[PDB]
Amino acid sequence: TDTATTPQTTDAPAFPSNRSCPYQLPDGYAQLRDTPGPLHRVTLYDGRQAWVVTKHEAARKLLGDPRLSSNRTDDNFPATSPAFEAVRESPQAFIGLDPPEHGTRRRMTISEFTVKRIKGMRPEVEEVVHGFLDEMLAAGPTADLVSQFALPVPSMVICRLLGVPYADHEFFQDASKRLVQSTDAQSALTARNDLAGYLDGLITQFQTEPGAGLVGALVADQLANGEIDREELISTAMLLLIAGHETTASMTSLSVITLLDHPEQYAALRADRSLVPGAVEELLRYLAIADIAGGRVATADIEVEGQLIRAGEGVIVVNSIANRDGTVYEDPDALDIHRSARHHLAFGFGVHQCLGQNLARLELEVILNALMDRVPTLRLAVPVEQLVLRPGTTIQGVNELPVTWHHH
Ligand code: HEM
Ligand SMILES: O=C(O)Cc1ccccc1Nc1c(Cl)cccc1Cl
């Protein structure tokens, strides 16, 4: 059988790409960033072509365009790995809904994420952060920052918000990781079913004995009024549980790696804590850990600066690339905790903009202040070159981060 004997250059490169450095664009993404025009063709894992959005203002425009639907069950939604077919087959939380249905479900959860509520959560967050730090610092001279700090902290916080008992954390933390990091459909489906069966039992328990937290409130109110389906409640709680776990944990580990590679800026941050909120925004822009959250499908033709998105085409708004748009962020590939990182897209834009964004901002501020206060000598226990980054088909991050510090 004959083989390929011609040049292999394509104008639709394979997407997504994997990071080789935790805080820099994959080489292929830098190329997309540099090509003029808002859109570029890519080839997804199964050979199907899709569009990516690579510029900041076009990304805002298209995330705001109701002709780009968030319906993951659509046959033309841009799947980036075989594991996505698990979500195409499963019931949908409001992240997969379009207006008006999106708003009726999202509004059932917003009361837990208001600015006033986030402010009232600071003592619990600080207590949780410092508690896990107490344990880690006492347990040995080295640690895995991920399993001992980065993951348990947001896990405990989101479980309190939801009413999910932390006694079961080994089970649902493992199931959350399996679902988010699954590479095939069968392991994704099993992880989803594991969480679904758990949450289903929690719902019945709350119907017997009304419970705390957001799940308790949805059971007692919207579910008892038929305003949400039981299966929808499960999907909604599952989305909040997984996002509340995995996103902040990834930001924590990648922020530590990044700050230790920029010691001048880390030292400036320690000397002036009023810089921490701005540094968190810059880290969000720079690390942009959730490109997998940009998929859309066109329900009508859309004209974009001379290019045409046709009805039925998949579109991925790649916020990591849009966040490196030099017409918005001067010298976009430089970390600068003093820059204005305003208007970044790490949380999206428009009706689906991250519900948890200010909880995440609170958590990362408390976490960075606590690391600088309690472990100012924190350092990586292995070279950055020995770390293993997750692939571009999931939330960016590291699954293990060996660290050490000065003893007690
Ligand atoms: C820590 C950093 C985080 C990042 C970078 C991030 C990123 C994102 C992005 C980019 C979207 C837009 C998805 C889209 O347009 O389809 C989104 C939506 C969402 N995020 Fe976050 N997220 C973070 C933390 C959290 C946390 C802590 C929660 C807590 C529950 C959360 C819950 C949600 C929900 C429910 C949505 C769907 C909003 C909607 O569809 O209306 N996220 N997130
Ligand atoms: O988005 C979903 O429906 C669930 C899901 C599963 C695996 C990986 C990511 C996600 N969602 C997701 C998104 Cl789209 C953005 C931020 C955080 C999370 Cl957990």
Side-chain angles (χ1 to χ4, degrees):
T1 309
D2 217 291
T3 62
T5 170
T6 57
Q8 295 299 287
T9 294
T10 177
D11 62 352
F15 183 92
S17 298
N18 298 339
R19 284 187 195 178
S20 52
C21 167
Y23 52 82
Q24 284 302 354
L25 297 181
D27 296 326
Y29 287 13
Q31 295 185 288
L32 294 172
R33 191 267 305 279
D34 289 353
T35 61
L39 305 177
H40 204 282
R41 304 178 182 92
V42 295
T43 304
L44 302 184
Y45 78 97
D46 58 353
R48 159 201 35 164
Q49 287 203 346
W51 293 103
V52 293
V53 188
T54 62
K55 307 295 186 287
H56 187 273
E57 188 50 35
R60 287 173 65 113
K61 179 163 185 336
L62 286 169
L63 285 168
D65 191 329
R67 295 170 296 183
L68 278 190
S69 164
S70 287
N71 180 12
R72 280 90 165 275
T73 71
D74 188 289
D75 288 305
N76 292 312
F77 191 92
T80 55
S81 74
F84 173 85
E85 305 302 325
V87 189
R88 182 179 270 116
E89 273 290 298
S90 304
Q92 293 203 105
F94 57 83
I95 194 170
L97 301 176
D98 301 319
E101 296 78 28
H102 165 258
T104 73
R105 271 85 190 98
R106 173 168 170 131
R107 282 190 297 273
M108 297 175 180
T109 69
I110 54 174
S111 63
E112 305 283 347
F113 295 91
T114 68
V115 286
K116 177 165 204 178
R117 211 73 98 185
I118 300 311
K119 172 180 186 173
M121 297 178 72
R122 169 178 305 273
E124 157 89 0
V125 176
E126 298 187 343
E127 184 194 341
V128 167
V129 166
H130 283 273
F132 282 106
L133 275 183
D134 290 348
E135 182 167 15
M136 186 187 75
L137 298 174
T142 63
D144 167 30
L145 194 75
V146 178
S147 62
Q148 292 176 244
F149 179 69
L151 181 71
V153 164
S155 183
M156 175 166 289
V157 173
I158 196 68
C159 285
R160 279 302 177 193
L161 182 149
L162 292 170
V164 170
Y166 196 78
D168 297 319
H169 70 271
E170 293 206 353
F171 165 80
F172 56 71
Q173 289 169 356
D174 175 74
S176 174
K177 181 183 182 178
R178 287 188 282 117
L179 179 48
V180 169
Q181 305 195 28
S182 58
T183 40
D184 62 294
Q186 196 33 77
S187 39
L189 283 171
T190 298
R192 195 217 188 272
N193 293 338
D194 289 339
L195 289 172
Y198 175 72
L199 294 164
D200 180 81
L202 192 63
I203 289 168
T204 296
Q205 188 187 111
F206 287 167
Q207 295 175 323
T208 302
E209 177 170 322
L214 176 56
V215 176
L218 291 169
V219 172
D221 190 358
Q222 283 86 354
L223 183 65
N225 281 268
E227 292 168 342
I228 191 172
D229 298 330
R230 186 176 183 106
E231 299 60 46
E232 285 185 294
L233 206 170
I234 292 173
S235 296
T236 306
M238 192 185 306
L239 171 65
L240 293 166
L241 186 68
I242 288 171
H245 275 69
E246 303 296 337
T247 60
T248 296
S250 289
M251 276 305 293
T252 294
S253 302
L254 291 179
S255 290
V256 169
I257 296 161
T258 303
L259 287 165
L260 294 173
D261 264 16
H262 299 79
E264 285 199 41
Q265 297 186 56
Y266 200 24
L269 191 58
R270 184 150 81 102
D272 181 1
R273 308 306 183 86
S274 74
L275 300 177
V276 171
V280 165
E281 291 308 297
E282 172 67 342
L283 286 160
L284 286 161
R285 175 196 76 94
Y286 200 59
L287 292 175
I289 60 161
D291 283 325
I292 60 131
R296 300 291 189 266
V297 55
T299 60
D301 287 9
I302 308 168
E303 319 182 296
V304 189
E305 310 186 32
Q307 304 216 255
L308 183 66
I309 300 171
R310 298 176 290 114
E313 284 194 298
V315 178
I316 302 174
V317 184
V318 187
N319 59 73
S320 61
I321 298 172
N323 280 349
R324 306 300 187 96
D325 190 333
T327 70
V328 180
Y329 306 109
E330 183 183 301
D331 301 300
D333 295 334
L335 183 75
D336 181 5
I337 60 169
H338 306 274
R339 80 162 69 242
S340 169
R342 300 182 63 69
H343 320 304
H344 70 75
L345 287 159
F347 293 123
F349 171 87
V351 298
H352 294 275
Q353 184 157 342
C354 179
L355 178 67
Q357 59 182 323
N358 292 325
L359 174 60
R361 287 174 168 115
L362 168 65
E363 288 170 334
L364 293 164
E365 170 270 306
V366 170
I367 284 165
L368 292 176
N369 273 312
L371 290 174
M372 295 185 290
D373 284 350
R374 307 271 309 270
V375 62
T377 70
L378 181 71
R379 55 195 180 81
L380 299 196
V382 300
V384 170
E385 295 91 332
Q386 292 180 11
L387 300 173
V388 176
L389 296 172
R390 301 173 190 153
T393 50
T394 186
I395 302 293
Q396 310 283 343
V398 290
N399 285 337
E400 193 173 344
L401 183 55
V403 296
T404 185
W405 58 82
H406 192 261
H407 82 94
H408 132 282

